[PDB]
Design a protein around this ligand. Structure first.
Ligand SMILES: [Mg+2]
Ligand SMILES: [Mg+2]
Ligand SMILES: [Mg+2]
Lengths: 233, 204, 214, 235, 195, 240, 244, 231, 222
């Protein structure tokens, strides 16, 4: 039995024609206090997988260590560790999902919601979610926390079903993700303006973007808003 | 559901001139219901006397336990255990069960066979020793006994006088307690003789 | 949970009768549940309380009874079989098992025997037992009409009529009636009887249930 | 001395090989498999005439569809039978079905090599496991203390095994009836036994799909012995 | 509720135990014998939590019977009562205690005296001329305190016992379906079939 | 824990520790079991090199396992106490779990199983004991007599003997005991048992113990004078 | 591995004997003789100390005779250190019984349990047996006065009079000669001392080389008293019987 | 001589005799052959019988859909090691949703056998194994020895008279390696290879045992009338 | 305090025919008022012509299915590739569920296939392992909506023969695979209208002697 202390908010993601995109802000909240501002919640594994984690940050750092140790262990007595027998997104996901379900079954969970985004060896897009309960699901768009309530509706307007994935380009998909992160900054009280974004493409590989900011915001109309009903001044 | 006040009972001990006295009521009940008027709460291992109040199953169990331990002590030491040593044994044994204690209020009384010095001691349920020159009280009428003893007691009483003082302390304390009474016993302990007297008291 | 199960000793052996309804609150999950567990060809058990607990452990009981007769080259007594089960659930006491069953059998040394076995460790030998949410309704019909010298035909009807009484009044009992006759040579199944059809049939033929329009 | 799980220079486990010598000293047991059933027969071999021969239990039921005959240090077989019975019943509990004869034999053979420095020594007893299932039909297995088991059409174990096995080589064919197999076990038992064969010092049994595993009465076996003697004198 | 009574007279011990077994709003049985013979001259009646009662009684029975075989000798009622008390004293501090109250009626063959011991689930032992468990003593002790004489015969003890049952049947809220009465004396244990 | 495999196979296929345990049984005092038509009798030898003995308190050779079953033995006395204790516990454990006392066959099978377990368990030696187990099954009047030995094999016997000079007394029983017609009465069965011990014992004074078991838990041990009467009767008939 | 160095203490010889038990008995045969004699009104325990030195403190010494409880005592023959291990176990067992049943332990039950412990060391554990033989002298209300003996095999037997340790063959013959059933304690005291005086390997039997104890009902009315004799009390009883 | 009592003892020349005696048990065992191309891997095994009345001892065991082995020596030891492989293959699938590499399978068997050769009380495994499989890096053939030594090969053979088949495969190396997309021809080469280890006896219908795994072929075993094609 | 259970919604449906059996389930996965996936399958082919679904808490449901699939695999290893009969699978699943009697899999399990006589079989389990063979069984969120409809249309309950004064019941008969799928599709479209946790898609697994076939149908996405 735990309670989360230092926490990370939404992780959002989607599939496009040649790969997947995933994003998450760089904040570590301490309740209502926006305590830590240089927190990376996207963690690459190899050159074909990115694990996006929300929830308890101490448990996130533990998972970072497990994934880093997983890469080491896979390289042992493995001449094809950088080729055919390299770590796949599906391998990394199933490992975490096994751990998360085992921990919930011992009543000592890792207080996280995780999204594993990547591209398989055959070019297929991989996008799957797992949380502190060991619950798993996949979808063309996936999001955690507030992202589930606000981002998914925007991302599902682009990719509403499986057949919409080949029709969606990386430019359009990135635009939707960046737009969603702005909406979360408007409406999520435990979000930050600064965020990281990662693209895993089957052709151009892994592109990891740090120190992004929400921009092109609309605040001007606020000056015209006066009082809460009757007040004219 | 308070283990120390289910069965009821009291024990009091006193020092006199070259003597000690220890007394107890004879009641054993199940809350409001009186069950036995022959439940003696004072035991002796050689010349050392032990009174025990509180939960009756633990009273019985501890007597059997200290009989066990004092018999083995005697076999190995080739001599009977003294009150000061026994007091430490009681304390050790009770503290061994610090987080699952016997619900008891024991009282040691006796005279050291070597020095001839009168000795009494009291304990809490986890073995804290309460040594005293004057008197020790225990049980569901301990408040009442404290009041009687503190006013009635005086130092260096002769055995025959000490008997009257301890008997009156016990009787009048027991009559202001619902869960105590139904008979009483007083041990008068001298260096090499011990007299045991049953008191006449009200049976309500 | 919701159920009506009975078992009684008589001249011709044992009658076992049960209802068939399973409910999750007000929702009727099933009308075709089996509340008689066929432990082996000679032994029967009733299901009341936890369905899984009764199924699992009375099936397990049959495995233990088979091992007994393999080692001793003799049929297991009803006393010993009931005891294996009651001793087992007693180990689990406090953990939350829910069981109220009648272990029924007919042997040479004992004759027809019934043991009420229960999840809090109780093990009672008796002539008549009724268990479940509708047990009171079934007891009334049983007590007033029961005799030791009942015929097999009349005894089967009494058990069937007693379940019907409960199925009618108890909301959590009904569906259908399953009958069994236990003899020294083994138990005999006496069919599934839909309460819907059975009620109207009994009403007409017996003259009972005048309060009900039909 | 020397280790219990030691290999010889020839590549065999000393203790396993020595246990095989104990089995050769044991009383004879024969099994024959047919399309109508499997027959199991044993030599009781009472050490003294005062010993009540009916208490000699060298043929044993494992389940309704599996039987067992033993030879060697027969006391060692008790825990093997107990395990077999538990394995058979446990599988029925888990899978609501009869267990395959081969799977039962494999379970018993897993105990065999669980010894060392687990139990202190190998078993000093060989088993003939006979049974029937829906998939492979009527089967006979020979389970050794080496952990190895062979399926057999016919098999003899014990003191007169090599002589009896040579006789089974000539006599066995794929069209044997159950009655023919019964007589054949009695015939070969009478040949290798020290004392004269009768219903008291020899025991028959069989396993059929219809009636399951059955140990024959002394009355039933006595008639088959009488039937056997008449047929040999008839030519 | 479960009623168990005990009376020690001049030459015997009499135990009376209720026949009813109730579960919920139904009397499942009205002929239940709430006792076990521990040895030829020692009888134990019991009452308390369902299941625990019989499981405990039979466990004690087995242990005393084992002792009898081992030593070819019958344990005294005092010795049996002390053993029983210790088992309950262990039990009360266990993970799940036996919630069982018992009376032990026995005839000591060496002393030629009847003995009645009352032991509750905590392991609280007392030797008494008459005893009870539960609410039973709340009704009967006033009658026993009055009419009980130490020199009574077995027949006088049964009449005194009848007086108690009558008072219980009058004032107790539940129907306990009468009592099974058993006598323990020099000749052993026997049951009174008509009560 | 001490793990050593003490009981192991030899090249010729023998387990010497089990066979040497039999030699301990051969050294032990003679014990004989004879079952009649409605009873079983257990006879036992007591060596007479021990005078100044207290026969009141000295452990008896025949032991009650339950009220209806008895166990005698030959071999190491200390070893027998362990088997007897285990048997007595199992007897009560059976009554507790199955509502019925043990059969003589079941009790024998248990004791024999314990003996077998000690022949292939690490760190233990076999029991240097063979037992004769006798009695009557619950609600049954057919006499039962079983024998066990260190290896763990057991079997039923019409009559049997174990211990020192047992081959002599077995020879006697083999010609004197008729299967078609066993000892019809208690007296006949006891006499045949005493006769068989008189082939080996020495004197019929305080050397022979006799215990008679009858149906429905009816077991009694004979006193010196009672046994001496059989000895006096047999010797007078012998001089012929 | 360690198999090489194992003596295998719990195995049979080809003749069916337990090597270590037999060799332990051989050790006990060199120990100082201990005699127990049971009378109708009490029991005597007499034991010879092993070659005493003049500077040995005699009065505050205990080698042979030990108290188990108020009603039971033992005479030791063999390794004293081994005996004390067993004695403390026996003392504890007696108290466990008293705690459980509120009655003093019957003599045989104590003897059986102590003998069962010895048996265990001969059948399992791979340890050497206890090189000790006991003579148990005790009283209970069932059988009255009782004498037992146990040895390293774990086998125990009851006796009217018995010796353990050295010269038991000679000692048992002398006891068998002069013992009779209607004997008194005072007579048994004399027999015990006379037997030791003749079987001793020493030149002359003296007070300083002996340990003595009685268990009488000589206390006031229906109760047993244990008397472990003092040096001066042994000196007096030795003169009174005319040995010195 | 004095240094072969247990596995924990080295000889003066640095040998482990108990391990060598375990190796000897394999030489007594019946012959089995392993070979592979780029697309498929094949096991061929000569089964042995007790007599004409007995069955033929099964030599080949399946470990997963993509992996399995053949045995030579103590069959129960093969059952233990094959069971361990089944669990390891299975652990890889449940935890990592990943088919176990044939190379890792060998590494795991090596380490399991090794522990039995360095500790007192235990004994070495008395069986040799030929593991075949098809994973992400194509077809594979491994040879396991109970010393712990595991070796990846194009082809090999173990058991009695295995030198004959091993010589043949050494000659035929260039031919059979290129049998791609043709199962029956690769088997034929394996059946012809094992035939070089035969003396007096020939390959019959209930004597021969074949197994195959490949690109679009799960690990499957052929016995009885199913191997009559290759005689 | 940490709650180890959740509700992923969804509803499933198993119907048994004469020589076939179907196991249907919606493809929507939810938590509270959010949709996690519009297509997350929860009816699986487990081998040996057995299809299985464990509806309720998805994490427990996936674990159970995964353990049963593994049980099928080891049944082949240990028993010479013997085919696991539907009745044997059912008994095995009871032991899987009851093994966690005191920390249950919070799922309603249904399996479907053919029995050993080739006839359609459906088995349903409670969370702790009690099971029963049935012709018809709905499980999950909208079971209460679907089940009484099946009683009426499959088992013909409350339907009497016209003109017979309600004395002669409408006769039971086996339905075709086509008629069963019609009832399944109408069951789910009706449940989709009235239950918020039901919708998005419908995936049906049909089992015959030939094998396991799949059919997919869209449902309303609101
Ligand atoms: Mg008062
Ligand atoms: Mg009052
Ligand atoms: Mg909506």
């Amino acid at each position: 039995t735990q309670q989360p202390i230092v926490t990370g908010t939404s992780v959002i993601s989607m599939k496009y024609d040649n790969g997947v995109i995933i994003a998450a802000d760089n904040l570590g909240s301490y309740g209502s206090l926006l305590r830590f501002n240089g927190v990376e919640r996207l963690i690459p594994v190899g050159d074909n997988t990115v694990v996006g984690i929300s929830g308890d940050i101490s448990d996130m750092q533990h998972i970072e260590r497990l994934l880093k140790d997983l890469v080491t262990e896979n390289a042992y007595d493995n001449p094809l560790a950088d080729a055919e027998e390299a770590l796949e997104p599906s391998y990394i996901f199933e490992y975490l999902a096994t751990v998360m379900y085992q921990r919930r079954s011992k009543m000592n969970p890792l207080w996280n919601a995780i999204i594993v985004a990547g591209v398989q060896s055959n070019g297929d897009q991989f996008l799957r979610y797992v949380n502190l309960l060991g619950v798993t699901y996949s979808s063309p768009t996936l999001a955690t926390g507030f992202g589930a309530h606000m981002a998914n509706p925007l991302l599902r307007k682009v990719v509403d079903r499986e057949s919409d994935i080949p029709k969606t380009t990386v430019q359009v998909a990135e635009e939707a993700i960046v737009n969603a992160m702005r909406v979360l900054y408007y409406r999520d009280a435990r979000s930050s303006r600064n965020f990281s974004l990662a693209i895993i493409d089957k052709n151009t590989g892994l592109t990891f973007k740090k120190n992004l900011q929400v921009e092109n915001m609309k605040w001007d109309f606020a000056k015209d808003i006066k009082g809460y009903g009757t007040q004219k001044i | 559901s308070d283990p120390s006040s289910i069965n009821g009972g009291i024990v009091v001990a006193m020092t006199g001139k070259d003597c000690v006295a220890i007394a107890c009521d004879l009641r054993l009940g199940s809350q409001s219901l009186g069950v036995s008027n022959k439940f003696e709460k004072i035991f002796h291992y050689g010349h050392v006397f032990l009174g025990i109040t509180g939960l009756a199953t633990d009273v019985t169990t501890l007597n059997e336990m200290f009989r066990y331990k004092t018999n083995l002590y005697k076999l190995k030491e080739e001599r009977a255990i003294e009150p000061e040593t026994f007091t430490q044994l009681v304390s050790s044994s009770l503290y061994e069960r610090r987080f699952g204690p016997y619900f008891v209020g024991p009282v040691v009384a006796g005279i050291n066979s070597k020095s001839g010095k009168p000795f009494i001691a009291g304990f809490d349920l986890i073995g804290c020793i309460d040594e005293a020159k004057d008197f020790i009280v225990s049980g569901t009428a301990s408040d009442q006994l404290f009041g009687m003893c503190e006013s009635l007691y005086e130092p260096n009483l002769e055995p025959e006088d000490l008997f009257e003082t301890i008997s009156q302390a016990l009787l009048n304390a027991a009559d202001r307690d619902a869960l105590s009474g139904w008979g009483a016993v007083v041990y008068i302990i001298k260096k090499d003789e011990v007299v045991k007297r049953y008191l006449k008291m009200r049976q309500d | 949970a919701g159920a009506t199960t009975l078992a009684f000793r008589f001249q011709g052996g044992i009658i076992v009768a049960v209802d068939s309804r399973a409910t999750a609150g007000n929702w009727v999950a099933s009308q075709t549940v089996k509340k008689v567990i066929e432990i082996n060809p000679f032994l029967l058990g009733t299901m009341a309380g936890g369905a899984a607990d009764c199924q699992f452990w009375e099936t397990w009981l049959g495995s233990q009874c088979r091992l007994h007769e393999l080692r001793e080259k003799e049929r297991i007594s009803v006393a010993a079989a009931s005891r294996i089960l009651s001793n087992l659930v007693y180990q689990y006491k406090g953990a939350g098992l829910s069981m109220g069953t009648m272990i029924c059998g007919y042997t040479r040394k004992e004759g027809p025997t019934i043991y009420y076995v229960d999840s809090d460790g109780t093990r009672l030998k008796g002539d008549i037992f009724c268990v479940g949410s509708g047990q009171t309704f079934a007891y009334g019909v049983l007590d007033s009409n029961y005799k030791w010298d009942l015929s097999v035909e009349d005894a089967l009807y009494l058990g069937k009529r007693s379940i019907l009484a409960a199925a009618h009044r108890d909301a959590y009992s009904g569906g259908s009636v399953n009958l069994y006759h236990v003899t020294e040579d083994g138990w005999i199944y006496h069919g599934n009887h839909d309460v819907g059809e059975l009620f109207w049939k009994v009403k007409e033929e017996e003259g009972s249930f005048n309060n009900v329009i039909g | 001395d020397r280790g219990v799980s030691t290999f010889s220079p020839e590549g065999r486990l000393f203790q396993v090989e020595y246990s095989l010598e104990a089995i050769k000293l044991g009383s004879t047991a024969i099994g024959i498999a047919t399309k109508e059933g499997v027959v199991l027969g044993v030599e009781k071999r009472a050490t003294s005439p005062l010993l009540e021969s009916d208490s000699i239990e060298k043929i044993v039921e494992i389940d309704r569809h599996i039987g067992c005959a033993m030879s060697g240090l027969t006391a060692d077989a008790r825990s093997m039978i107990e395990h077999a019975r538990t394995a058979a019943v446990t599988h029925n509990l888990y899978y609501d079905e009869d267990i395959n004869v081969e799977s039962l034999t494999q379970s018993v053979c897993d105990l065999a090599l669980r010894f060392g420095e687990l139990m202190s020594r190998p078993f000093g007893v060989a088993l003939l496991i006979a049974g029937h299932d829906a998939d492979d039909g009527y089967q006979l297995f020979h389970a050794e203390p080496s952990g190895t088991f062979y399926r057999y059409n016919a098999k003899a174990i014990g003191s007169g095994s090599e002589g009896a096995q040579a006789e089974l080589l000539n006599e066995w064919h794929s069209s044997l009836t159950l009655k023919e197999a019964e007589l054949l076990v009695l015939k070969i038992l009478k040949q290798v036994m020290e004392e004269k064969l009768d219903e008291n010092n020899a025991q028959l049994s069989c396993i059929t799909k219809q009636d399951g595993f059955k140990i024959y009465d002394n009355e039933k076996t006595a008639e088959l012995i009488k039937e056997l003697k008449e047929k040999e004198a008839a030519e | 509720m479960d009623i168990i009574l005990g009376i020690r007279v001049q030459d015997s011990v009499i135990l009376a135990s209720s026949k009813a077994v109730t579960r919920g709003i139904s009397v499942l049985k009205d002929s239940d014998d709430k006792t076990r013979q521990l040895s030829p001259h020692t009888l134990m009646s019991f009452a308390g939590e369902a299941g625990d009662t019989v499981q405990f009684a039979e466990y004690i029975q087995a242990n005393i019977q084992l002792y009898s075989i081992r030593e070819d000798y019958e344990l005294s009622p005092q010795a049996v009562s002390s053993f029983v008390r210790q088992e309950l004293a262990k039990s009360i501090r266990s993970r799940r205690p036996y919630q069982v109250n018992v009376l032990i009626g026995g005839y000591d063959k060496k002393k030629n005296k009847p003995e009645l011991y009352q032991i509750d689930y905590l392991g609280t032992k007392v030797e008494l001329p008459y005893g009870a468990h539960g609410y039973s003593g709340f009704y009967t002790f006033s009658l026993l305190d009055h009419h009980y004489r130490p020199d009574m015969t077995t027949e006088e003890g049964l009449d005194l016992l009848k007086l108690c049952v009558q008072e219980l049947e009058k004032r107790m809220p539940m129907d306990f379906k009468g009592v099974i009465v058993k006598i323990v004396d020099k000749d052993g244990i026997r049951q009174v079939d008509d009560f | 824990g001490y793990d050593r495999a003490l009981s192991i196979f030899s090249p010729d296929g023998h387990i010497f520790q089990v066979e040497y345990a039999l030699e301990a049984v051969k050294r032990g005092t003679c014990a004989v079991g004879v079952k009649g038509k409605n009873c079983v009798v257990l006879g036992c030898e007591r060596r007479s090199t021990l005078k100044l003995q207290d026969t009141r308190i000295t452990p008896s050779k025949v032991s009650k396992i339950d009220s209806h079953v008895v166990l005698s033995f030959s071999g190491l006395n200390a070893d027998s106490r362990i088997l007897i204790e285990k048997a007595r516990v199992e007897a009560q454990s059976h009554r507790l779990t199955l509502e019925d006392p043990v059969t003589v066959e079941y009790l024998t099978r248990y004791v024999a199983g314990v003996q077998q377990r000690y022949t292939q368990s690490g760190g233990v030696r076999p029991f240097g004991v063979s037992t004769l187990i006798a009695g009557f099954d619950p609600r049954d009047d057919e006499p039962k007599l079983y024998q066990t030995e260190p290896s763990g094999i057991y079997s039923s016997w019409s009559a049997q003997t174990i211990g020192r000079n047992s081959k002599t007394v077995r020879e006697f029983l083999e010609k004197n005991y008729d299967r078609k017609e066993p000892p019809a009465t208690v007296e006949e069965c006891v006499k045949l048992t005493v006769r068989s011990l008189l082939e080996v014992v020495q004197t019929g004074a305080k050397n022979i113990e006799i215990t008679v078991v009858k149906p429905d838990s009816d077991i009694v041990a004979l006193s010196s004078e009672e046994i001496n009467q059989y000895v006096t009767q047999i010797e007078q008939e012998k001089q012929e | 591995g360690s198999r090489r160095y194992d003596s295998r203490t719990t195995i049979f010889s080809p003749e069916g004997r337990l090597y270590q038990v037999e060799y332990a008995l051989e050790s006990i045969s060199h120990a100082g003789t201990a005699i127990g004699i049971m009378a109708s009104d009490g029991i005597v325990l007499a034991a010879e100390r092993k070659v005493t030195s003049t500077l040995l403190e005699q009065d505050t010494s205990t080698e042979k005779l030990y108290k188990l409880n108020d009603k039971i005592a033992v005479a030791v023959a063999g390794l004293t250190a081994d005996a004390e291990i067993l004695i403390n176990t026996a003392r504890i067992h007696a108290q466990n019984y008293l705690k459980t049943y509120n009655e003093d332990i019957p003599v045989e039950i104590l003897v059986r349990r102590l003998s069962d412990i010895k048996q265990g060391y001969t059948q399992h554990g791979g340890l050497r047996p206890f090189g000790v033989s006991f003579i148990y002298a005790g009283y209970d209300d069932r059988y009255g006065y009782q004498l037992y003996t146990s040895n390293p095999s774990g086998n125990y037997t009851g006796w009217k009079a018995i010796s353990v340790g050295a010269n038991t063959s000679a000692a048992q013959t002398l006891l068998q000669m002069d013992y009779k059933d209607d004997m008194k304690v005072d007579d048994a005291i004399e027999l015990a001392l006379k037997t030791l005086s003749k079987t001793t390997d020493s030149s002359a039997l003296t007070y300083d080389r002996l340990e003595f104890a009685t268990i009488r009902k000589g206390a006031n009315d229906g109760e047993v008293y244990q008397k472990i004799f003092k040096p001066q009390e042994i000196k007096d009883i030795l003169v009174k019987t005319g040995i010195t | 001589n004095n240094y072969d009592g247990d596995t924990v003892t080295f000889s003066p020349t640095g040998r482990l005799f108990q391990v060598e005696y375990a190796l000897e048990a394999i030489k007594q065992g019946s012959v089995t052959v392993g070979l592979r191309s780029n697309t498929h891997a094949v096991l061929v095994a000569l089964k042995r019988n007790a007599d004409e009345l007995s069955s033929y001892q099964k030599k080949i065991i399946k470990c997963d859909e993509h992996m399995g082995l053949s045995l030579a020596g103590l069959a129960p030891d093969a059952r233990v090691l094959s069971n361990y492989l089944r669990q390891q293959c299975n652990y890889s699938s449940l935890v990592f949703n990943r088919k176990l590499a044939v190379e890792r399978a060998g590494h795991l068997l090596c380490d399991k056998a090794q522990k039995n050769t360095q500790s007192y009380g235990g004994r070495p495994y008395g069986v040799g194994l030929l593991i075949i499989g098809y994973d992400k890096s194509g077809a594979h053939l491994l040879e396991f020895q109970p010393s712990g030594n595991v070796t990846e090969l194009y082809g090999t053979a173990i058991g009695a008279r295995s030198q004959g088949a091993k010589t043949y495969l050494e000659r035929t190396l260039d031919t059979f390696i290129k049998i791609d997309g043709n199962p029956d021809e690769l088997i034929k080469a394996g059946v012809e290879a094992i035939s070089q280890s035969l003396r007096d006896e020939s390959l019959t219908v209930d004597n021969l045992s074949i197994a195959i795994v490949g690109k679009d072929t799960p690990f499957t075993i052929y016995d009885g009338e199913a191997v009559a094609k290759y005689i | 305090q940490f709650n180890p259970y959740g509700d992923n919604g969804g509803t499933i449906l198993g119907i048994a025919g004469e020589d076939f059996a179907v196991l249907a389930g919606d493809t929507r996965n939810i938590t509270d008022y959010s949709i996690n996936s519009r297509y997350e399958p929860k009816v699986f082919d487990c081998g040996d012509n057995i299809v299985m679904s464990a509806n309720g808490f998805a994490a427990d449901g996936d674990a159970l299915v995964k353990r049963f699939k593994n049980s099928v695999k080891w049944y082949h290893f240990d028993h010479n590739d013997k085919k696991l009969s539907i009745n044997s699978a059912a008994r095995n699943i009871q032991h899987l569920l009851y093994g966690k009697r005191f920390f249950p899999y919070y799922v309603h399990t249904i399996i479907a296939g053919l029995d050993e006589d080739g006839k359609g079989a459906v088995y349903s389990f409670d969370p702790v392992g009690s099971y029963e063979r049935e012709q018809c069984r709905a499980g999950g969120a909208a079971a209460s909506l679907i089940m009484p409809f099946l009683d009426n249309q499959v088992n013909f309950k409350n339907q009497y023969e016209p003109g017979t004064n309600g004395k002669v019941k409408k006769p039971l008969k086996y339905l075709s695979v086509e008629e069963v799928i019609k009832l399944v599709r109408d069951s789910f479209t009706s449940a989709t209208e009235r239950h918020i946790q039901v919708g998005d898609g419908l995936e049906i697994l049909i089992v015959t002697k030939d094998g396991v076939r799949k059919e997919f149908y869209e449902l309303k996405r609101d």
